[PDB]
Amino acid sequence: TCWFEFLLEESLLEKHLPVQLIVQFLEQASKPNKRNRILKLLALKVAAHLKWDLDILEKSLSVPVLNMLLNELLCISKVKHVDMDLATLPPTTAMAVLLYNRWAIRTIVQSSFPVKQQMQQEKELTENILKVLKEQAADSILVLEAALKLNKDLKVKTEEMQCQVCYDLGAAYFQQGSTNSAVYENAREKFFRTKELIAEIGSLSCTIDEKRLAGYCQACDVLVPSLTPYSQVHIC
Amino acid sequence: VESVCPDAAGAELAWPPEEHARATVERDLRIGRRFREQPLLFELLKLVAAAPPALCYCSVLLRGLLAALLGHWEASRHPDTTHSPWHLEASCTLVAVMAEGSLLPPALGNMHEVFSQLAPFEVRLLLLSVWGFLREHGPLPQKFIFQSERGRFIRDFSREGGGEGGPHLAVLHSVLHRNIDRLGLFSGRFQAP
């Protein structure tokens, strides 16, 4: 039950049947080639054992460790994201690219969320990553929009992935809506699309916050109306 | 001001940096205790705020109450704000008084309604945003232009420059986004127009 033990055997990960393993493997691999490659492969394998659930990895793993894991996934998958268009790419590479874009847009959305107030280096790295993704947020938004539009087709349901990516796009537009009120229309459209998709599929599988989606829909119904005495009073 | 905060070591109307709050903990806590003991003080604050320029002269009491509320929310370990009813209502009523005296913009003045659905650090950051706005603008009578058509002084935040809370509304909107599962229906109170 340590970093050294996992690197020895190639089958003890099956006997273990995780996020602590992710952070340990990433810290060992990034410490100042075959061993690093094996550690990265093991980290990707155990990460895939969680069905690539972005919520658990985001809440457990920090910004730089998750960024390094996703960068390793992209490096081993495809090796610029805007021009790929996810048309002729293999489904694994396309899903990895859209997952990376979804994580990036979630982190840039979550970075504005207020929070209660080695460590300095980690904070500097997180700030640098946030600035870099700020410089490339439009590319991620365009890639997510293209992936949502290109619903051609392990393998999961296309509807669930489209709903997740359009929910992330709507959250990003709502975050961007503070500066410009015209962005809220796109946020409202994306939230309506993801609500319709969730109602149509009815499958837990992936997993989204129902209360947060309801709050987003309520906020969009009053920001861009296009009932309660509250809303009647505001509208009139 | 003479009855509540007689020392008036910081009698200047404009607001000082928030780092000065820890320098006058005793005076601001005394002001907060006086407010808690006498509920009539808020009523006189609203009466003063009825005249627009008069609330500028209450800026010392306003800053003391804001600092006391900020310190309590710093020391508030409760997951919500309903466990401290007096402090929550004092923040709400202080924000209402300041907005009523036109010391805060309407977009940044509707912030007290969502105080009850927030954990202590969100409302602390919000009151810090109020302090920051009153630092950038300041409750000063000369910003009030006497409108002779109706005979009432008018504080034009549009003419002040960034008076609608340019950077100050960013914190409020971030708080709304974080708690969108509960603050979705209140988004109409914080719109730019």
From Swiss-Prot, chain A:
Domain comment (free text): The WFEF motif is required for the recruitment of protein phosphatase 2A (PP2A) to transcription pause-release checkpoint.
GO annotations of cellular component type: chromatin; INTAC complex; integrator complex; nucleoplasm; nucleus
Motif (WFEF motif): 3-8
Protein name as annotated: Integrator complex subunit 8
Sequence ranges of the TPR repeats: 163-201
Disease: Neurodevelopmental disorder with cerebellar hypoplasia and spasticity: An autosomal recessive neurodevelopmental disorder characterized by global developmental delay, profound intellectual disability, seizures, absent speech, spasticity, facial and limb dysmorphism, and subtle structural brain abnormalities including cerebellar hypoplasia.
Membership in a protein family: Belongs to the Integrator subunit 8 family.
Assembly mode: Component of the Integrator complex, composed of core subunits INTS1, INTS2, INTS3, INTS4, INTS5, INTS6, INTS7, INTS8, INTS9/RC74, INTS10, INTS11/CPSF3L, INTS12, INTS13, INTS14 and INTS15. The core complex associates with protein phosphatase 2A subunits PPP2CA and PPP2R1A, to form the Integrator-PP2A (INTAC) complex.
Intrachain S-S bonds: none
Entry keywords, A to Z: Chromosome, Disease variant, Intellectual disability, Nucleus, Phosphoprotein, Repeat, TPR repeat
Taxonomic source organism: Homo sapiens
Keyword Cell cycle annotated: no
Keyword Nucleotide-binding on entry: no
Function recorded in the entry: Component of the integrator complex, a multiprotein complex that terminates RNA polymerase II (Pol II) transcription in the promoter-proximal region of genes.
Localization annotation: Nucleus; Chromosome
Domain of life: Eukaryota
Chief location bin: nucleus
Record lineage: Eukaryota, Metazoa, Chordata, Craniata, Vertebrata
GO BP: protein localization to chromatin; regulation of transcription elongation by RNA polymerase II; RNA polymerase II transcription initiation surveillance; snRNA 3'-end processing; snRNA processing
UniProtKB/Swiss-Prot annotation, chain B:
Coiled coil: none
Entry superkingdom: Eukaryota
Membrane spanning stretches: 40-60, 114-134
Compartments (UniProt record): Nucleus; Cytoplasm; Nucleus membrane
Function: Component of the integrator complex, a multiprotein complex that terminates RNA polymerase II (Pol II) transcription in the promoter-proximal region of genes.
UniProt subunit comment: Component of the Integrator complex, composed of core subunits INTS1, INTS2, INTS3, INTS4, INTS5, INTS6, INTS7, INTS8, INTS9/RC74, INTS10, INTS11/CPSF3L, INTS12, INTS13, INTS14 and INTS15. The core complex associates with protein phosphatase 2A subunits PPP2CA and PPP2R1A, to form the Integrator-PP2A (INTAC) complex.
Family of this protein: Belongs to the Integrator subunit 5 family.
Protein name: Integrator complex subunit 5
Species this chain originates from: Homo sapiens (Human)
Boundaries of the shown chain within the full protein: 817 to 1009 of 1019
